[PDB]
Design a protein around this ligand. Structure first.
Ligand SMILES: N[C@@H](CCC(=O)N[C@@H](CS)C(=O)NCC(=O)O)C(=O)O
Ligand SMILES: N[C@@H](CCC(=O)N[C@@H](CS)C(=O)NCC(=O)O)C(=O)O
Ligand SMILES: O=[N+]([O-])c1ccc(SCCCCCCO)c2nonc12
Ligand SMILES: O=[N+]([O-])c1ccc(SCCCCCCO)c2nonc12
Lengths: 208, 209
């Protein structure tokens, strides 16, 4: 069984939660309040002084993308071969890059930086549209014909950007259809509709 | 060679993967991209995320430095002995990437104003890797398990460039210090690090270090 240790926010656990839900995996949520975190003891015990912390039986992991890659590896969501595995990494690293830019905006420069960020957004999303266009016309997944951890990470990136800049996918038919298609997967649909997801803020500072 | 590295004339985000290839006795081609060629725009427009490095393994074209590291890691058997070790290797590399991003931000956006604060924060940033070494065979081997991983090469570069930025930063970290000496002494890697191919490239693209 799995345990997710995190703040009461979607943030960097959103993608891995979607993965677990869609894959019909059970997990426990250990919700850490800001007050508990500010006490200091849990933070000091964390490898890089940060969350998420993740438990897979006796194995304890840190780093959101390590968790995603671990679940991808152990559950067979990492491409069909080494070639696809490399492409999956390439997508995920791209998602991470834009997530970092997004987080920087949200937490450090929302008011002054939003206009420039949204203006630059089309150019940041186009690589993912291009990737879909080059994989079976964008009719399946981001890499190959089976779902990967990168799909869940990209899906979250796209969902949070729809909130930040409504209509940001309108120019991108493959990304638009991809979001709708993945979101309609029965277990994922149910999770995305649940208060467990809906009633958490996207970020920790009330900005989105 | 089956491998091609496409990059600016700098060490930067290719240093670790080059060390990996050299230490593993692999052949590769270097394709150098000048400031002018980059400013022209055509190569940049053709890159997936508009950035370098670009890497070729036969007809497989990759972008993203850590994607290249993981690809070489998997293919050359530098990704742990099993699934659990693979996760630990990823955990290390993600930590290295996190600090590398902070390093790059200092170098390229805020060197003069940010250096003092960065160097003050540095011991707290390096400590986790010392901790990991201490919990793995007393720090006498590698960062994860008893065989070298792509994370070792990435960590090694991170440590080398930080010793240039903050001389003596590893004085506080005996295991990290010995680790750098040990890995740097690996014969193929030692030869590569001493070679014009490595030495005559700057660490960064703006002449800061
Ligand atoms: N590279 C890390 C970063 C994790 C991170 O930024 N953690 C934040 C929340 S998403 C945190 O624990 N902030 C609290 C702190 O640093 O004190 C990952 O992917 O997990
Ligand atoms: N996430 C990327 C970052 C790549 C990157 O920041 N590339 C820089 C050189 S290291 C670049 O191409 N800058 C030129 C530009 O953006 O025009 C990776 O790991 O490869
Ligand atoms: O992915 N992030 O950069 C990130 C996620 C979540 C949060 S919310 C964490 C709330 C706990 C309070 C401590 C904030 O440093 C972040 N705060 O600064 N960067 C954050
Ligand atoms: O890893 N980096 O963030 C990074 C590496 C190398 C460089 S140097 C690239 C030189 C090309 C610049 C050409 C000027 O139009 C970085 N510049 O900004 N971030 C950089």
């Amino acid at each position: 069984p799995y345990t997710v240790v995190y703040f009461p926010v979607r943030g960097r656990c959103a993608a891995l939660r979607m993965l677990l839900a869609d894959q019909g995996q059970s997990w426990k949520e250990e919700v850490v309040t800001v007050e508990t975190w500010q006490e200091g003891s849990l933070k000091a015990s964390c490898l890089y002084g940060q969350l998420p912390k993740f438990q897979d039986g006796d194995l304890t992991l840190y780093q959101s993308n390590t968790i995603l890659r671990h679940l991808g590896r152990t559950l067979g969501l990492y491409g069909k071969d080494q070639q696809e595995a490399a492409l999956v990494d390439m997508v995920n690293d791209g998602v991470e890059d834009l997530r970092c830019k997004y987080a920087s905006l949200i937490y450090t420069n929302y008011e002054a930086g939003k206009d420039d960020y949204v203006k630059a957004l089309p150019g940041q999303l186009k690589p993912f549209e291009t990737l879909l266009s080059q994989n079976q016309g964008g009719k399946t997944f981001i890499v190959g014909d089976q779902i990967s951890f990168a799909d869940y990470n990209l899906l979250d990136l796209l969902l949070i950007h729809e909130v930040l800049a409504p209509g940001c996918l309108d120019a991108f038919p493959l990304l638009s259809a991809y979001v709708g298609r993945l979101s309609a997967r029965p277990k994922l649909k149910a999770f995305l509709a649940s208060p467990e997801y809906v009633n958490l803020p996207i970020n920790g500072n009330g900005k989105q």
